[PDB]
Design a protein around this nucleic acid. Sequence first.
RNA 1: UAAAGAUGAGACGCGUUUUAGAGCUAGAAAUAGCAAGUUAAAAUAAGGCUAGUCCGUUAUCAACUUGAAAAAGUGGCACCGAGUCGGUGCUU
Lengths: 88, 1359
Amino acid sequence: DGKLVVSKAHFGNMIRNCQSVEDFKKSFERLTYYSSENRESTVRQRLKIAEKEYNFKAGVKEDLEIKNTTDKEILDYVRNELSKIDSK
Amino acid sequence: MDKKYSIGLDIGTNSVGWAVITDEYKVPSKKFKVLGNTDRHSIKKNLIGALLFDSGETAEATRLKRTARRRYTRRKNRICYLQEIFSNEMAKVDDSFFHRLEESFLVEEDKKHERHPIFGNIVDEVAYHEKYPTIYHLRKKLVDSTDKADLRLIYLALAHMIKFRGHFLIEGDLNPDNSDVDKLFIQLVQTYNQLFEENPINASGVDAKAILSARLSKSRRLENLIAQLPGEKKNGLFGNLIALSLGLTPNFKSNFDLAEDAKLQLSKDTYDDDLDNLLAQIGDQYADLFLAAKNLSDAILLSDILRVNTEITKAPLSASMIKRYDEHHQDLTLLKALVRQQLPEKYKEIFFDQSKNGYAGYIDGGASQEEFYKFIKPILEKMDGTEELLVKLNREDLLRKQRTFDNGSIPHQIHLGELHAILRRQEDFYPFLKDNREKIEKILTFRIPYYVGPLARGNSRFAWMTRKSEETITPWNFEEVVDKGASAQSFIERMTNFDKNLPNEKVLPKHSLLYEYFTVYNELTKVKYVTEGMRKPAFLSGEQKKAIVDLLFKTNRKVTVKQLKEDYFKKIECFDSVEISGVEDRFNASLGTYHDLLKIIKDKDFLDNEENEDILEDIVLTLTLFEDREMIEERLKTYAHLFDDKVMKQLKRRRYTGWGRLSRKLINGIRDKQSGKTILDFLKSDGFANRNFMQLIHDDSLTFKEDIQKAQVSDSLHEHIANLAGSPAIKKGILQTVKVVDELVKVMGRHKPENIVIEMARENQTTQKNSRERMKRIEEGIKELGSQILKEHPVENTQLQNEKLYLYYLQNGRDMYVDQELDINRLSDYDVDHIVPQSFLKDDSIDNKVLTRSDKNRGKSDNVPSEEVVKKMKNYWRQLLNAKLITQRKFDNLTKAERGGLSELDKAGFIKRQLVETRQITKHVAQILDSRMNTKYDENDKLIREVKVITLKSKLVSDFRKDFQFYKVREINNYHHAHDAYLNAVVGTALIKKYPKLESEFVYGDYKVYDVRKMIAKSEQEITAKYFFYSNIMNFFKTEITLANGEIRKRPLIETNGETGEIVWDKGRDFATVRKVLSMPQVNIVKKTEVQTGGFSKESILPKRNSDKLIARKKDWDPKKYGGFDSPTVAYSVLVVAKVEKGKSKKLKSVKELLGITIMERSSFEKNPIDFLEAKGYKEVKKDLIIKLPKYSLFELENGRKRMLASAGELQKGNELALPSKYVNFLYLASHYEKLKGSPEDNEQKQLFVEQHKHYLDEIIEQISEFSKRVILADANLDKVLSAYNKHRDKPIREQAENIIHLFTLTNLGAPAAFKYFDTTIDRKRYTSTKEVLDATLIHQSITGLYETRIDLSQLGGD
RNA sequence: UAAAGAUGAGACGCGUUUUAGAGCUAGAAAUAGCAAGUUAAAAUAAGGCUAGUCCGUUAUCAACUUGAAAAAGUGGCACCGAGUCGGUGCUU
């Protein structure tokens, strides 16, 4: 329904490198991956992949001295969406 | 009204036959209830049957796929670590650089950013790709130059060095000791002379770097290096190791005199298992040799990649690859000019056509380098002006791509050197590179140890790592989060096997010192010697064993016999000449780790102190388990005061591999109760009859069988069948045997049987390979002698299939009992005689048989022959003895008259040979079934044995079938699996009731062993408390035992117990019973229905193609854009009754289809099947009628025609042919017309049987034809084979019968197969339509076939 | 004569797919002639949930009943026959 042509490995690669919350919302609303031949993955699966990747990018910049002023913004957005799913 | 029964079993890799007999040896019969919706409610079935199942495979390919997946995960993490270092200043240089590298896969229309990955406009991309045509131009520029470079180009160089980083085979730094060609060559000749101390290869002046590292061809470098050696063969072992190191294909056949070919090549990806297959043959001390050839191989390849000296650039690899690039450019320009100028018509197929192997097929087309060379070499030979390009083509240096397969020999210290030089050039301009420098270099060099494993957190069945803290493991905090002592202790507790004999005990390493003293005393305890004045050739006394092991196994590495005869016998004990028996020209054991550690420490007193055992055992254990330098440092801290630093640092570099199979407590820990000795004390000094290891476990005089027996207890059943030693096929056989016995006990009113007879036959006759040792055995045997038989009559391993001819050459063409020669032409008129007769033991072997001219030449003795041929042919048997053709056992059996007839010890030896099931897999099977049936305890905490369990030999039942004409043809039907199990239960129970004082020797359990010498009568007609004068235990089935001299002793027709008078065998009735059960029409053959698992399809990646029959390897990907799976595999099929839409009228036409579920879709189907089917175009699906149909689901059509479902659109034959037993004896006797293995009198009677019953062939053709017209139902092939039979009705019978056995492949069970009569190859008749099955009757069956549920499929779909 | 026997951990290099590396001239077009090519990025069973620097091709598996699942239950006996199992009493 107007979303691009990738898979799950490419889904995770292509939503890693966002630099704001609004860019992650746009690049999240443009991609999918089908979990089998006729069904699309649920939004909680895609948000859990984005949680894993901004957890990695959020946490490895703390093993270094690198200022992760974003990637804790995007990770908090991801975790609040996942909380709004799983509370319901 | 009988209630006692028995069970016969026979286990296989694809079959478990089974039976139930009662006390009169009759298979009973019962009316079984039938469930389902049909109008049949019961059927009689027999209690005989066979289960059939496909083989299990190993977890090896699953292992390899697993480890490749986790390597791709970890490589991708390396790239993300590096990007997360660069992202904060890269985010100032270019905001979308990581995005563009992240979406480069996409088509131009799909990308958000611009289509050029690195720079973003096209002018800078053409400029970038003109200045830097490869990545090595970029890498070399960043290493050399001093200008501030762009941050993108520094990321691209560091990412190309971190993603493709090299191997971790070399430890530490690169020095002349471990990476120059000449020092690896010196290590190869030191390892070589270490293996061959008799021939030291002198390499005093060989400049190996200048010879094996010159820009030459491989054969030219080989022949130059061999020519520099003083007097060596190019085709020797050393020339094969040097040519192995260069990269050719040497043949290791002529070095070790193997029967087959051994082509090893290092770039060939089967070098691992081919190397293991050679080390399974030629010994296992050659692994340091074939490893020291591989280290030289990567030294040669690495010094042939880096064709650039240092002190010009800091980057050798990059400048070397630009050199390769420019050579490609100038040879390509020269080749295009020489083809345009001379051969203009081949320019299109060299430089344009890519399906050929020209340059278009090399660059664009997917050919390798070698295919390109085989293509264009005759093109270059024709042309004029192609001298230099043929010089390069002979040298594998023509038109080289830079990412070749040879790049697997670059260490990571090259990439680390260039990495560090870039970070030191470019850090005055970028400060974060200076701060993060050691952190980037950690990303390259970090490597997870073997002893840590997957970095799991409680959710994998492969990992054991324990965490010192709860953080995420990165490369920069690995040695802070991982508890390495606890992880290493879990590693030792997991990777160390358990002892089979004495469980919960760990096996020693194979290079342990105690395992080496054990194997040396185990070899020295059975070596004999004969001396003039020592005419009874005894073993070695134990003090002689201690002196021989303290003078020879502690001086030399390998000990051949000449130092035993020279240094000990001729010098210490000072004889003149002593022959040594039991050892063949060299010992096979060695004290190798004693010499390794002795070379490292150089202190004899430390190794021989013998109170320093646990230190050295812990050293060899540490060097066996671990390969990490830092953990080997961490564990040998405690022994550091016993050594200096050079010996310590030299101990760290010595890795051993291999786990043995015997624990420490099994060698020194358990004791004999009578003597107070361990197994190693028996092997050092035993006394009179020095018994080795197996003769210590399997001796009832000693406590060892009691301790090992009582200690083998072992949990659940899958642990019992997981822990034991065997292939996964036979373990599937054992698990199905356990389930079969459980349901046979459930059938019989839950009464446990009197017996369970078990027999595990084999299918391992594969070759001919034993006939190579037959031919070679006559070669070495006659070449020992000096006779004139090989010259006048040459041997070959195709003529020696005749045993009269093999025995003709083995006896040097000479008659045994008469001093005469033998004609080779008249083997039809010569007799074969067993020395020890058949009435004492069944011995058809080559050890027992002697070829003679007249069978009555052996005198008149019903026992072993006389002593005239002993005293006359003594030196003849000496010449045949020393030729390694006849053995000392055969000479002793020929001289049993010289030692005064047979004794009762001899006969106890014959029963000892006949009874004992010596293998260990059957002994674990009887342990499992005995521990599973016999569970009850009495008052005294002993074990009441309700169920005896019996293991027989295979040759007992085989000789029963041969001697009483219950012949077996494996090709007619599958009933022989059932009939072998029935004959196990018959034979074993008749033996268990006939001789009840031999129950200690084939019933599993702790039984009172009785004096076998006292259960043997001394006179013939004596028979009171005796069992037999004739020691063949299978005589009492026979009515007429036959003496060797030519008499017939007739036994009584009713055999009873010799003590209690129970009637156990009646010859007038029980043969009629057995022959009546081996011809029943109904036998419960079952094929086990298995859901298919495995890979999702054929697993190659294909290009883009517009066919809609290709399911893509990803999801949104249109298969016309990328490509996909060629043929996906079906897990199981599903019968669906639903209404589909018929067409444009949108009608709800109800169909009943058969839909396969694939391995990819299987879990999606099992999640919600109504949603699954309904999204595939099935409205109105009923949940109660989805019927899972796995492979080999059985259906029944009309007229008793059955079909097994092979796949969702294919069927297989489901019926069996109960051919009458007279035709089966006719086919066996007819098609085995020569190979009869009996006397010519009764085999002449068998020739009268086939000749007087030649019309049985026509009646068999009537059987096959009527069965074929009822259920096989292939009319064209049946008329084709009736015509084919009519074209040959005058042929000999031994090929008409031998081809009717080929005709039964039409009427078998299973997949239809193409066979071949006299002339006609008949193609297979596939059943490609599953349309008739939807009206058939589905039969669900339990493992025995007896309880079944039959479903009427035509009553499904109506409403 | 008997006796490894399977199972597990770490790491390279290719290979294969897309995509980037400006195609030029003649021609309305088909087509023809010429140029060039060696490398890189990403993916590497589909995917999964516990989100690990983990798991995803082994072993296990008739049907029905109770169970979330490891699991536990469900099927009279005896004689005379035998073409894939029939007939005959006996308690039901």
